[PDB]
Design a binder for this molecule. Structure first.
Ligand SMILES: [Mg+2]
Ligand SMILES: [Mg+2]
Length: 114
RNA sequence: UAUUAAUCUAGAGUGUGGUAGGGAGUUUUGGAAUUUCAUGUGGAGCGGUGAAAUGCGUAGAUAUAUGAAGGAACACCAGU
């Protein structure tokens, strides 16, 4: 019932999440590779991210919005598959802002696996 | 060569004039980010891996927005 909104596309290296939300807080729908039905390691493939983006795009288009600001987050692999899925869905993409957390040399990261 | 009695400025210092620095200690201040807590939206997974399983989750997790608390370290500048 709202024309403009935000789409948070978080791409973890292990999984992906797409949350369609009102311009200020109050997420309106959400989807992820797990809710798609993919399980285990298949959740981290770009195709699963595209599937999740397509489902959420169809859902929110039937809900009836037009303009989307796409907030890209994380450092996965299928970071652009969701972008192309939304573009193919056809919602008016206005902004491509990226908001993956960057630190200013605070907090100690985990150990390096070997 | 050593000792003694002296002179000299070229070694080494001192003064005046230019001057570059993440040199050191003490006392205040700041912003990103993680975590926890509080309050809204939401509804089945999240997390993790070579693949999974312990684990967290309908007592409403992951996500999203706002606020508070505290701790540690100070992106970019940053380098033939
Ligand atoms: Mg590790
Ligand atoms: Mg916050």
């Amino acid at each position: 019932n709202v024309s403009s909104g935000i789409i948070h596309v978080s791409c973890s290296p292990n999984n992906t999440i797409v949350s369609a939300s009102d311009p200020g807080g109050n997420v309106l729908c959400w989807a992820s590779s797990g809710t798609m039905g993919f399980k285990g390691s298949r959740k981290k493939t770009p195709y699963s991210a595209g599937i999740a983006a397509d489902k959420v795009a169809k859902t929110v288009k039937e809900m009836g919005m037009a303009t989307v600001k796409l907030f890209v987050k994380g450092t996965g692999r299928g970071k652009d598959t969701a972008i192309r899925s939304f573009a193919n869905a056809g919602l008016s993409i206005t902004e491509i802002n990226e908001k993956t957390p960057i630190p200013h040399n605070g907090c100690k990261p985990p150990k390096r696996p070997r």
